[PDB]
């Protein structure tokens, strides 16, 4: 347990729905909260939900303001916060950020630096999976040049998946697309992610995307909170997520969950993370660990009864999953019906899913039995800007039966 793990005040280094989600968990745990906001985001709901809030990244473009490591730390220190929750996206998988947070004496609500290092890099993450004896996808030894990539396609054949270590990916069906694909992806890598390393995997045909929720504490307890099926995707971007994976047999699901736990036990994983697999005809292949909370954590909470975000914060406070946080042993983790999450966004499906902008005139949100809402920026009078993601509200439903 790190020194300084006691908390009275927490800052979220994020915006939108995930910031509001963390503030709610903080308030329920008796912690006071701090928001940061870019100028252009000054009407975001999360700014007003916190107990106090601060402008950051003055004079920068809005996305750069939220990536402004030193200004965020400045606010944390100036407000007297104990802890930073990084949410998802933005700096949440960023080694440099977590290093400087912890170097500034603050609790970073997340896993060890070493985990951000090996799971933030998808080559390194595959190496850790082999070492833990979790089946991966046949891929290049490490990072490769165009010649080692072309080599792989001679060894295993097309089609193949070109992926950046920091994704960020292109499918190649032949040589021409391999030359084109490797170029475009090495662009967006040095581009939106800062570095240019690249690896190649066999492209699996029509997989399911199954991922497993993990919690680890600082006392060597690791548990899984079952899995989620995130196969419903458009251009490889998650659209609808369900839990559990109701189209797979319980035994096969348990096998996937155990493999995730095996990997996490091997590396001593701390806090919330998710292990992601591709699944094809009763085999499964490791692809990634997201060493952070995910947008779809909500549906896992509904089918287990476990508040994942409150857990993350209590874990960071040095608490024990079982004795203090009060989670049961693995075999006693509830599995209560099923749950579905959709993200309602301003993407116009009749205009190539370009996000709409402008003023929200009317916003009336449903409720009732089996409905959960986690709102982003949607309220009557809010102006949707072009600067940020297009999320309005996350809707989850839950019931005993999938059909209901």
């Amino acid at each position: 347990v790190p020194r300084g793990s006691h908390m009275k005040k927490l800052l979220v280094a994020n915006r939108g729905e995930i910031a509001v989600r963390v503030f709610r968990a903080c308030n329920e745990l008796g912690l006071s909260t701090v928001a940061v906001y870019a100028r252009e985001d000054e009407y975001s709901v999360h700014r007003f939900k916190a107990d106090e809030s601060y402008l950051i990244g003055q004079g920068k473009k809005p996305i750069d303001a939220y990536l402004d490591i030193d200004d965020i730390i400045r606010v944390a220190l100036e407000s007297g916060a104990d802890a930073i929750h990084p949410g998802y996206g933005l700096l949440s998988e960023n080694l440099e950020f977590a290093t400087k947070v912890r170097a500034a004496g603050l609790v970073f609500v997340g896993p060890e630096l070493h985990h951000l290092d090996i799971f933030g890099d998808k080559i390194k993450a595959k190496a850790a999976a082999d070492e833990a004896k979790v089946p991966g996808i046949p891929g290049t030894n490490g990072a490769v040049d165009i010649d080692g990539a072309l080599e792989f396609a001679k060894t295993y054949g097309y089609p193949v998946m070109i992926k950046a270590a920091l994704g960020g990916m292109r499918v190649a069906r032949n040589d021409a697309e391999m030359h084109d694909g490797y170029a475009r992806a090495k662009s967006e890598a040095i581009g939106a992610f800062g570095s240019g390393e690249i690896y190649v995997e066999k492209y699996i045909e029509n997989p399911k995307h199954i991922e497993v929720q993990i919690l680890g504490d600082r006392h060597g307890n690791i548990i899984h909170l079952h899995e989620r099926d995130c196969s419903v995707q458009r251009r490889n971007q998650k659209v609808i997520e369900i839990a559990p994976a109701v189209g797979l047999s319980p035994d096969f699901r348990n096998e996937i969950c155990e493999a995730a736990v095996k990997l996490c036990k091997n590396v001593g994983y701390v806090n919330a993370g998710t292990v992601e697999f591709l699944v094809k005809d009763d085999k499964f292949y490791f692809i990634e660990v997201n060493p952070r909370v995910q947008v779809e954590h909500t549906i896992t909470e509904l089918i287990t009864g476990v508040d994942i975000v409150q857990a993350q914060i209590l874990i960071a406070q040095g608490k024990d999953l079982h004795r203090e946080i009060g989670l049961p042993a693995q075999s006693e983790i509830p599995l209560l019906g099923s749950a579905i999450q959709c993200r309602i966004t301003t993407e116009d499906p009749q205009n190539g899913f370009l996000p709409d902008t402008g003023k929200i005139d009317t916003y009336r949100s449903p409720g009732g039995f089996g409905i959960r809402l986690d709102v982003g920026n949607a309220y009557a009078g809010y102006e949707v800007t072009p600067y940020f993601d297009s999320l309005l509200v996350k809707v989850c439903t839950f019931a005993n039966e999938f059909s209901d």
Binding site: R24, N27, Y43, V45, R47, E52, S53, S79, G381
Partner: protein, 654 residues
């Protein structure tokens, strides 16, 4: 489940109707509920559930203030429309780390500061920008909000300064009465931003910053609290140079471990042998007496800017031979001779001089800090200041001064008639207002002329607040009622003389040099009580316990020592400040243009109301007034629409 309910109940935002939410919140807090043991008679038998806090609302007071000013203007200035202003420039400083007089005071005490001054070859500077400069040029209206934006740059960029004059004079009551901000808040805020700069105040020996007759224990308590709250240098003066009014203050400042400057007010002309009353021997004899009080430093206060350079030179050279205390000279640049007078004083060995930043200098202010540096640069004795830093800092003040256009006295330029009438600046602008209000603006030159004749009629007196007001009230009165000096002596028995004049001649301001003219005194005072000793001796006794309990009742919370002393100094003003705080809240936090003009249609402002709390306020609509003067403004406050009713006074007063 309970915690989630508690979270949800507090998170709900419902406006326009009342709800039962405060009641629900109380129920679920109670341990009968949270233990699961409630019965059907629990609520009906628990009266604590029906106690609700006042729901706190700084947002609404702010919208009220912004609507008031937007629609009705700021009191006493023209209700005009608000300019767009850029952010004031921030200085680019080249920092040099040095030990300062303030560091010496704190580590080694007052006498060590004095030795540091005596061992300095350069002339040292005191910066008046935060007090006397705006008192002269901007009717003392300069706001904390503007001062705190540059304070740290002054502390770090100009460590050479002896002190910053930042308190006292008119700042104490103007802050409360016209700015709706506390002078103590100003001192605390600045004290933290400027930890290495000595803070100087102007302090009237007999009554600190007030205008009534306070007893000794009040003056001593003022000094204690002021010293505790961060005042380092007390410049103690008396309006008639009457040493008995200064003695106790000097001792209390010494007792509190701070620096006492004892002041001589300069008047007349040492180089005019036809005016021997205030000749050089007068000043040397008073200086010797002040030195004997144990004062650390002798201040020469030329409040009207009368000192010409050959007189400055003679005055300072003679004083330096008469006393061993360092001499701190203060003049005004009203005649256009301020720099040449400071240069003369420098050649005569003056230790410290009072200067203002260039952008708040000249005219009835002090001479410019940056100017005197360059006047002396090639001489035998330099000014101690980082001039390049000072030039950069001046950019900020030049930008900030534009905000105060409604309070400008007029064009800042030389005026040599000051040698004739001898009014200090404020006495000049005030006396101009007073003559206006009584419809004599068109004869203000006859009034300047009468001011001078009155001064001689009263025996040739020292004219600084409040003795200068005495001479002014009388001159105005005499012009208003068409009297000459003959007339006053002939018909004075049947005339009612202004209040301040009667108080003067009753000895309520103390004793003047050479006494009063006897006949005129009888004529003026009639059957009122005349004293000839120190007014403070006759003051109503003051019990701090009694006063503190009375005040607590009046304001509804326990007053700190600083509040109690404010209340004693200015009772009705302090109470009126409290009412304005309750109505409009902490207006000190508004930027100056918004404080003075409110908002324009479609404007967005950001008000920093606490650390980590900012109100984003946008004015969306300004409704037209109905026949009773009701106007409805629609704001957006932090994402909510807010409808605000304000009464349009111009419709009322039609």
């Amino acid at each position: 489940s309970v915690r989630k309910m508690d979270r949800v109940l507090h998170e709900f935002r419902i406006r326009g109707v009342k709800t039962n939410i405060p009641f629900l919140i109380n129920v679920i807090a109670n341990e009968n509920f949270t233990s699961g043991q409630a019965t059907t008679t629990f609520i009906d038998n628990t009266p604590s559930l029906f106690n609700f806090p006042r729901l706190r609302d700084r947002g609404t007071k702010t919208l009220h203030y912004l609507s008031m000013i937007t629609v009705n203007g700021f009191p006493g200035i023209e209700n005009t429309e608000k300019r767009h202003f850029e952010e004031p420039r921030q200085p680019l400083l080249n920092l040099e780390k040095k030990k300062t007089a303030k560091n010496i005071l704190d580590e080694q005490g007052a006498d060590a500061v004095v030795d540091y001054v005596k061992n300095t070859k350069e002339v040292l500077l005191t910066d008046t920008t935060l007090r006397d400069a705006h008192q002269s040029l901007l009717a003392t209206r300069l706001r904390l909000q503007d001062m705190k934006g540059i304070a740290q740059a002054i502390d770090q960029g100009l460590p050479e300064l002896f002190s910053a004059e930042m308190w006292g004079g008119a700042t104490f009551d103007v802050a409360y009465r016209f700015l709706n901000e506390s002078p103590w808040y100003r001192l605390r805020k600045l004290r933290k931003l400027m930890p290495n700069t000595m803070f100087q105040m102007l302090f009237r020996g007999s009554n600190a910053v007030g205008y009534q007759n306070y007893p000794d224990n009040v003056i001593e308590e003022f000094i204690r609290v002021a010293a505790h709250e961060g005042i380092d240098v007390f410049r103690i003066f008396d309006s008639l140079n009457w040493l008995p009014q200064m003695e106790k203050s000097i001792q209390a400042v010494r007792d509190n471990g701070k620096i006492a400057e004892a002041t001589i007010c300069y008047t007349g002309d040492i180089l005019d042998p036809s005016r021997p009353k205030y000749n050089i021997q007068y000043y040397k004899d008073l200086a010797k007496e002040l030195e004997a009080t144990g004062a650390h430093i002798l201040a020469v206060k030329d409040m009207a800017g009368l000192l010409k350079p050959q007189a400055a030179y003679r005055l300072i050279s003679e004083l330096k031979d008469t006393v061993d205390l360092p001499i701190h000279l203060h003049t005004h640049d009203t005649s256009g001779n301020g720099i040449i007078t400071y240069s003369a004083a420098t050649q005569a060995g003056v230790d410290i001089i009072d200067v203002a930043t260039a952008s708040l200098a000249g005219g009835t202010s002090q001479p410019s800090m940056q100017s005197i540096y360059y006047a002396l640069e090639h001489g035998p004795r330099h000014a101690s200041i980082n001039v390049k830093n000072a030039e950069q800092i001046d950019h900020y003040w030049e930008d900030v001064r534009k905000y105060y256009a409604p309070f400008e006295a007029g064009i800042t330029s030389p005026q040599t008639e000051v040698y004739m009438h001898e009014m200090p600046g404020g006495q000049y602008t005030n006396l101009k207002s007073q003559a206006a209000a009584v419809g004599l603006g068109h004869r203000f030159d006859e009034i300047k002329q009468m001011y001078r004749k009155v001064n001689m009629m009263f025996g040739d007196i020292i004219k600084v607040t409040p003795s200068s007001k005495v001479v002014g009230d009388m001159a105005l009165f005499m012009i208003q009622n068409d009297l000459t000096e003959e007339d006053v002596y002939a018909r004075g028995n049947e005339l009612n003389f202004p209040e301040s004049v009667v108080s003067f001649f009753r000895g309520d301001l103390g004793q003047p040099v050479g006494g009063f003219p006897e006949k005129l005194q009888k004529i003026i005072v009639k059957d009122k009580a005349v004293i000839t000793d120190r007014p403070g001796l006759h003051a109503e006794k003051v019990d701090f316990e009694t006063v503190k309990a009375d005040l607590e009742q009046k304001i509804g919370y326990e007053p700190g020592d600083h509040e109690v002393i404010s209340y004693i100094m200015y009772p009705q003003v302090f109470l009126d400040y409290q009412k304005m705080q309750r109505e409009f809240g902490a207006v000190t936090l508004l930027d100056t243009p918004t404080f003075l003009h409110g908002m324009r249609l479609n404007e967005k402002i950001e008000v920093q109301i606490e650390k980590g709390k900012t109100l984003s306020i946008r004015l969306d609509e300004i409704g037209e007034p109905d026949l009773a003067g009701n106007r409805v403004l629609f704001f957006n406050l932090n994402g909510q629409r807010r409808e605000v009713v304000i009464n349009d006074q111009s419709v009322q007063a039609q």
